[PDB]
C-alpha cells in the first residue's frame, strides 16, 4: 500500500516519543516502559489499518489538488500519519475495552489483552485508557502549532463520545428497553420485540460508522487544510452508509467467517446480540422458525449455536446479505458520483477507503 | 460553601444540556436518557467537590484581584463551575473505572456503580468512558468562544494521561517490577523489597496529585486569565506536596477510618497494596514485626487483616503520620508565603484549598 512504509515508520516514531516523554514526566522505569512498549505493539499493531491509512490516503489526495512546496507536502504526509495513528490507538482503546466487556479469547490471531496471563482484566482497564490519553497527546506534541490542532481534538472527542453512546445502545440491546434500570437486574428479552431495523442501524452507526470511516475523512482534511472545500453534509452521509455496511459485514462474518481467517471468536449468538443476522432473520423467517430461533439464541450450549447457524443458512442470510450489498454499492456509488462532480480528488479518496470496504473477507 | 449553590445549580444546567445533545446528535431513547441521567447523578454526586469548588474559588479570588466588573464576574464564575464540573466528571470517571479493578463494595455511601444490579462491570466500564467524554463535550460546548479553550483540553487531557499512568504504578506495585511481563503471570511479592518511600510517592503524585491539587488550581487560574500572574514551578510545587499528603490521609483512613464515615471499604490490606502505612511500617519496624507483617498481609482472611492493623498499631503509624503531617504543615506555610509575597490573592486560594485538606476526617 503507498503509505504503509511511511505510516510504520512514523509509529515508531510516535512510540519512541510517547514512552521518552513518561521517562521525562513521570519518573518512568525500565521495566514499566518495556511494558508499555509491549503493550503499544499488542493492541495497536496487526490490524487492518484501514482508518490510520485512509487519513493519509485523503490528506496526499487532497494536498496534490492544492499548490505546495516539497517540504509542504512532507509535513502534511508527516502530520497525516501522525493523525492515522490517533485514529488506530483510539482503535486499539476501544478494542481493549471491547475485549473485556465481550469477554472475548481472541484479537488479531492472539489472546486478547486482557487474558494475557501477565495482564488480566484489573490491568487491562486501565492500560485502555492509557492509549486513549496517548492519542490525545500524539496532537497536542505534533501539532503543538498547526492551525488545525482545535479541530483536530473537537472532532475526535466528539467521535469519541458518539461512540461510547453507541457502546451504550450496544450493551443495552439485549434487555427490554422498558425493564432497562440500574438498581433491578433484568434478564435478557425472550421475545425480541425491539431486535428492529431501527435498533439495529442506531447500534452500528455510532458504534462504528462515526470512528471508522467519518473521522478518518475528515481528519484527512484537517490536515490538508481541505475540510471547507468539500460538502460536509454529503461526506458525513457517505460515511454513514459505508460504516453501516461494514459493520454489517462484522456481524456476518461472526457467524460464516472461520474464527481463524477472521482472527478472532465472535460469540454473537451465545450473547443474543442484536446483530444484522438475528434482526433480519426474526424480521423475515417464518412463526415456527422464529419460535425455534428464539428456544435456542443467548446460549452457550453448542447445540443450541450449532442450531442457529443451520437456522441463518436455511433462511439464507448470506443470500440476504448479498442483495443489502447489492443495494449498498448501488447507493455508494451515487453519492461517490455527487462528490466527484463536487471535488474530484475527495471522491477519489472516499473510492480507495470504499474499495478497501467492498467484499471484503476480514 | 461560598459557591456550592451556584455549583450545584450550574450541574443541573450541564446534566440538561448534556442529555439534550444525545437526544440531538445521537437518537437517545427515553429509557436510555434516564438510565444516564441516573448514572451521571450516582457517579458524579455525593462526594465532598473539593476539585470542583476549588476552580470556583481561584477564580473568584483572581476575578477579585484584576477588578472585573459585574458582567465579566458572572461569565467567569460560571466558566469556573463549567471547569469545576470537568474535574468532578474527570473524577467520577476515575472512580468508576477503579471501583471495577479494585473489586470493591461501596462508594459514597451507596453501593459502587458497577455494583447496582441492573448495572455489571460489563456494562459500567463504558459508562465510565461516557463519563469521561462529557468531560470534555463541556469545554467544547461552553468554551467555544473562548481563547482559554486550548490550553483548558491541553492541561485537562494532560492530567488525565499522568493519572493513568499513576494508576499503571498502582496497579503493577504488588509484584516485583523486574518480573512485569504480559505473557507470564507472577505471585503477589513475598519480600516486599520495592516497598519504598520512592515508589509510593512515585504513585501517589501521579495517580492522585496532578488531577486533585494541579488541575483544579490551573483551571481556576485559566478561566480567569491569570496563569501568567503566578509563579509556575512553586504553584506545581505546592500542588505536589498537598497531593501527596492527600493520598497519604486516603491510605491512613483505608485502615483507621471506619468506613461508614469513610463512606467506602478500602482493602488495601487484602490487596498488598502499596499503601503509605505498608511502606512506614516496612522501612521503620524491627525484624521481628516485619516477618509478621510479610506472614499475615495481602490475605483476605478478616485475622490476618486485624493482625495488620495491630501491627501498624503497636508501630505508632498513627504517630508517625502526625509527624509527617508537622513536617508538611512547615513546607506547605513556607510554599504559600513565597506565592503570597508575588500573588496575594492567588495565595489565599491555595490557603482556602489547603484548609479543607489539613486533618480532613474523610
Ligand atoms: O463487539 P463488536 O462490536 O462486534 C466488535 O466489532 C468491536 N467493536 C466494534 C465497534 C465498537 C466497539 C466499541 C466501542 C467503544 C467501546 C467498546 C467497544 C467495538 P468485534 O467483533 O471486533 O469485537
Ligand atoms: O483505590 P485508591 O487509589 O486508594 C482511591 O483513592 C481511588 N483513586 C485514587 C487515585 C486515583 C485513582 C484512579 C485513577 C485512574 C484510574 C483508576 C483509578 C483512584 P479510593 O480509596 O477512593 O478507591
Ligand atoms: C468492526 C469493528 C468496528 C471493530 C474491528 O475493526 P477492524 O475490523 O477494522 O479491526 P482491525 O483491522 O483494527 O483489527
Ligand atoms: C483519594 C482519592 C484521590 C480518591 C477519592 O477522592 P475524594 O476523597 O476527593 O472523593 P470524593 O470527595 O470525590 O468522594
Ligand atoms: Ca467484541
Ligand atoms: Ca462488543
Ligand atoms: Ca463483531
Ligand atoms: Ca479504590
Ligand atoms: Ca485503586
Ligand atoms: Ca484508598
Ligand atoms: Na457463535
Ligand atoms: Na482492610
Given at each position: 500500500?503507498?503509505?504503509?512504509?511511511?505510516?510504520?515508520?512514523?509509529?515508531?516514531?510516535?512510540q519512541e516519543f510517547?514512552?521518552?516523554?513518561?521517562?521525562?514526566?513521570?519518573?518512568?522505569?525500565?521495566?514499566?516502559?518495556?511494558?508499555?512498549?509491549?503493550?503499544?505493539?499488542?493492541?495497536?499493531?496487526?490490524?487492518?489499518?484501514?482508518?490510520?491509512?485512509?487519513?493519509?490516503?485523503?490528506?496526499?489526495?487532497?494536498?496534490?489538488?492544492?499548490?505546495?512546496?516539497?517540504?509542504?507536502?512532507?509535513?502534511?504526509?508527516?502530520?497525516?500519519?501522525?493523525?492515522?495513528?490517533?485514529?488506530?490507538?483510539?482503535?486499539?482503546?476501544?478494542?481493549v475495552?471491547?475485549?473485556?466487556?465481550?469477554?472475548?479469547?481472541?484479537?488479531?490471531?492472539?489472546?486478547?489483552?486482557?487474558?494475557?496471563?501477565?495482564?488480566?482484566?484489573?490491568?487491562?482497564?486501565?492500560?485502555?485508557?492509557?492509549?486513549?490519553?496517548?492519542a490525545?497527546?500524539?496532537?497536542?506534541?505534533?501539532?503543538?502549532?498547526?492551525?488545525?490542532?482545535?479541530?483536530?481534538?473537537?472532532?475526535?472527542?466528539?467521535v469519541?463520545?458518539?461512540?461510547?453512546?453507541?457502546?451504550?445502545?450496544?450493551?443495552?440491546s439485549?434487555?427490554?428497553?422498558?425493564?432497562?434500570?440500574?438498581?433491578?437486574?433484568?434478564?435478557?428479552?425472550?421475545?425480541?420485540?425491539?431486535?428492529?431495523?431501527?435498533?439495529?442501524?442506531?447500534?452500528?452507526?455510532?458504534?462504528?460508522?462515526?470512528?471508522?470511516?467519518?473521522?478518518?475523512?475528515?481528519?484527512?482534511?484537517?490536515?490538508?487544510?481541505?475540510?471547507?472545500?468539500?460538502?460536509?453534509?454529503?461526506?458525513?452521509?457517505?460515511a454513514?452508509?459505508?460504516?453501516?455496511y461494514?459493520?454489517?459485514?462484522?456481524?456476518?462474518?461472526?457467524?460464516?467467517?472461520?474464527?481463524e481467517?477472521?482472527?478472532?471468536?465472535?460469540?454473537?449468538?451465545?450473547?443474543?446480540?442484536?446483530?444484522?443476522?438475528?434482526?433480519?432473520?426474526?424480521?423475515?423467517?417464518?412463526?415456527?422458525?422464529?419460535?425455534?430461533?428464539?428456544?435456542?439464541?443467548?446460549?452457550?450450549?453448542?447445540?443450541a449455536?450449532?442450531?442457529?447457524?443451520q437456522?441463518?443458512?436455511?433462511?439464507?442470510?448470506?443470500?440476504?446479505?448479498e442483495?443489502?450489498?447489492?443495494?449498498?454499492?448501488?447507493?455508494?456509488?451515487?453519492?461517490?458520483?455527487?462528490?466527484?462532480?463536487?471535488?474530484?480528488?475527495?471522491?477519489?479518496?472516499?473510492?480507495?477507503?470504499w474499495?478497501?470496504?467492498?467484499?471484503?473477507?476480514?
Amino acid at each position: 500500500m503507498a503509505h504503509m512504509e511511511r505510516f510504520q515508520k512514523v509509529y515508531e516514531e510516535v512510540q519512541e516519543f510517547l514512552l521518552g516523554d513518561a521517562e521525562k514526566r513521570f519518573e518512568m522505569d525500565v521495566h514499566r516502559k518495556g511494558y508499555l512498549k509491549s503493550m503499544m505493539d499488542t493492541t495497536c499493531l496487526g490490524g487492518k489499518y484501514n482508518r490510520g491509512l485512509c487519513v493519509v490516503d485523503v490528506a496526499e489526495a487532497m494536498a496534490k489538488d492544492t499548490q505546495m512546496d516539497a517540504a509542504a507536502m512532507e509535513r502534511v504526509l508527516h502530520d497525516a500519519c501522525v493523525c492515522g495513528w490517533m485514529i488506530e490507538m483510539l482503535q486499539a482503546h476501544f478494542l481493549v475495552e471491547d475485549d473485556i466487556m465481550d469477554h472475548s479469547k481472541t484479537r488479531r490471531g492472539k489472546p486478547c489483552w486482557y487474558l494475557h496471563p501477565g495482564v488480566t482484566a484489573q490491568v487491562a482497564i486501565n492500560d485502555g485508557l492509557i492509549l486513549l490519553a496517548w492519542a490525545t497527546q500524539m496532537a497536542l506534541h505534533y501539532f503543538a502549532d498547526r492551525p488545525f490542532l482545535a479541530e483536530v481534538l473537537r472532532v475526535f472527542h466528539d467521535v469519541d463520545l458518539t461512540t461510547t453512546i453507541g457502546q451504550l445502545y450496544d450493551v443495552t440491546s439485549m434487555v427490554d428497553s422498558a425493564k432497562l434500570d440500574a438498581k433491578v437486574a433484568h434478564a435478557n428479552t425472550t421475545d425480541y420485540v425491539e431486535y428492529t431495523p431501527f435498533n439495529h442501524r442506531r447500534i452500528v452507526v455510532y458504534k462504528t460508522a462515526y470512528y471508522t470511516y467519518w473521522l478518518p475523512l475528515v481528519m484527512g482534511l484537517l490536515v490538508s487544510g481541505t475540510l471547507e472545500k468539500v460538502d460536509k453534509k454529503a461526506t458525513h452521509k457517505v460515511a454513514m452508509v459505508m460504516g453501516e455496511y461494514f459493520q454489517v459485514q462484522d456481524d456476518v462474518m461472526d457467524c460464516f467467517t472461520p474464527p481463524e481467517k477472521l482472527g478472532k471468536i465472535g460469540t454473537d449468538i451465545e450473547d443474543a446480540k442484536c446483530s444484522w443476522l438475528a434482526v433480519t432473520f426474526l424480521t423475515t423467517a417464518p412463526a415456527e422458525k422464529v419460535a425455534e430461533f428464539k428456544a435456542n439464541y443467548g446460549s452457550t450450549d453448542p447445540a443450541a449455536v450449532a442450531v442457529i447457524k443451520q437456522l441463518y443458512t436455511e433462511q439464507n442470510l448470506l443470500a440476504r446479505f448479498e442483495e443489502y450489498e447489492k443495494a449498498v454499492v448501488a447507493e455508494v456509488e451515487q453519492l461517490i458520483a455527487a462528490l466527484e462532480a463536487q471535488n474530484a480528488a475527495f471522491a477519489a479518496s472516499v473510492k480507495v477507503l470504499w474499495s478497501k470496504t467492498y467484499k471484503r473477507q476480514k
